[PDB]
Amino acid sequence: GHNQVIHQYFDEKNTSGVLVIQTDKKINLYGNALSRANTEYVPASTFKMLNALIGLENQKTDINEIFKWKGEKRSATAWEKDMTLGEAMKLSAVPVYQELARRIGLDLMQEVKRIGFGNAEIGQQVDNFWLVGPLKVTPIQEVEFVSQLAHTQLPFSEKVQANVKNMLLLEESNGYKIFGKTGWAADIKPQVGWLTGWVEQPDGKIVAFALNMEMRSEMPASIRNELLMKSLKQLNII
Numbered sequence: 435g436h437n438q439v440i441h442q443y444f445d446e447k448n449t450s451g452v453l454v455i456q457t458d459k460k461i462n463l464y465g466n467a468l469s470r471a472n473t474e475y476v477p478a479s480t481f482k483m484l485n486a487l488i489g490l491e492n493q494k495t496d497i498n499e500i501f502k503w504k505g506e507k508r509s510a511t512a513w514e515k516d517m518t519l520g521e522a523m524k525l526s527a528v529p530v531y532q533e534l535a536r537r538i539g540l541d542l543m544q545e546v547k548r549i550g551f552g553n554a555e556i557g558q559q560v561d562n563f564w565l566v567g568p569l570k571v572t573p574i575q576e577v578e579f580v581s582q583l584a585h586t587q588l589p590f591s592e593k594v595q596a597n598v599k600n601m602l603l604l605e606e607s608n609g610y611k612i613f614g615k616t617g618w619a620a621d622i623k624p625q626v627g628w629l630t631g632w633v634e635q636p637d638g639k640i641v642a643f644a645l646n647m648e649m650r651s652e653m654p655a656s657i658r659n660e661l662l663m664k665s666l667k668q669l670n671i672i
């Protein structure tokens with residue numbers, strides 16, 4: 435797998451991003467803008483993985499609790515229904531995890547400094563610190579986080595991590611499995627899109643990734659998966 439084809443996938447999408455990969459504590463960089471791997475961006479919709487872990491661990495919820503939609507007009511129309519913590523993970527429904535963050539509370543949430551995620555600061559507003567700061571995390575710190583979650587090595591209960599892991603399955607073909615969570619901080623300039631997860635190769639081998647790239651409103655949501663899937667195809671991970 436050349437480190438140069440990576441460039442022309444990103445050259446052709448007219449973007450500026452990096453694809454971090456980790457295979458058992460050996461990290462390789464892959465992008466047309468490799469410097470972004472050590473650059474702090476807001477975590478956006480990816481924080482839902484740590485929000486679910488902190489909630490399920492502290493028993494502020496469970497994998498079964500159904501969240502009632504109480505009428506208000508939400509961003510996308512697929513969010514306007516009752517759903518559980520898992521279905522809200524797939525749809526990235528923000529209002530659900532906000533109510534969970536209020537159950538946890540700012541004091542208990544500021545667990546974040548114990549896990550050592552990003553700059554480890556959440557400010558005062560407990561329901562929008564991952565969307566416009568003051569929380570920022572580097573794509574290297576992200577790929578290390580999901581690497582521990584896949585190997586079931588995060589500082590939480592073993593049953594809690596495996597529950598969050600089951601909420602993150604995206605594609606299961608050819609004995610492979612690809613877990614991950616998407617993000618898109620559309621409210622900051624320049625915009626930034628995420629796609630952090632891992633690959634469960636058929637032999638159980640684990641390869642974690644953390645795709646970071648600048649976003650624009652005109653891009654499709656399937657521009658992140660398209661860019662990643664053709665890169666794991668090239669690196670012979672799938």
Ligand SMILES: *C(=O)[C@@H]([C@@H]1NC(C(=O)O)=C(S[C@H]2CN[C@@H](C(=O)N(C)C)C2)[C@@H]1C)[C@@H](C)O
Nearest residue numbers: 478479509510526528565616617618619655
């Ligand atoms: C998390 O970034 C937001 C949540 N996640 C998310 C995504 O990354 O897919 C969408 S934003 C993105 C999805 N399509 C675009 C759109 O608004 N439509 C075409 C409907 C933008 C979603 C908002 C969380 C902060 O809401």
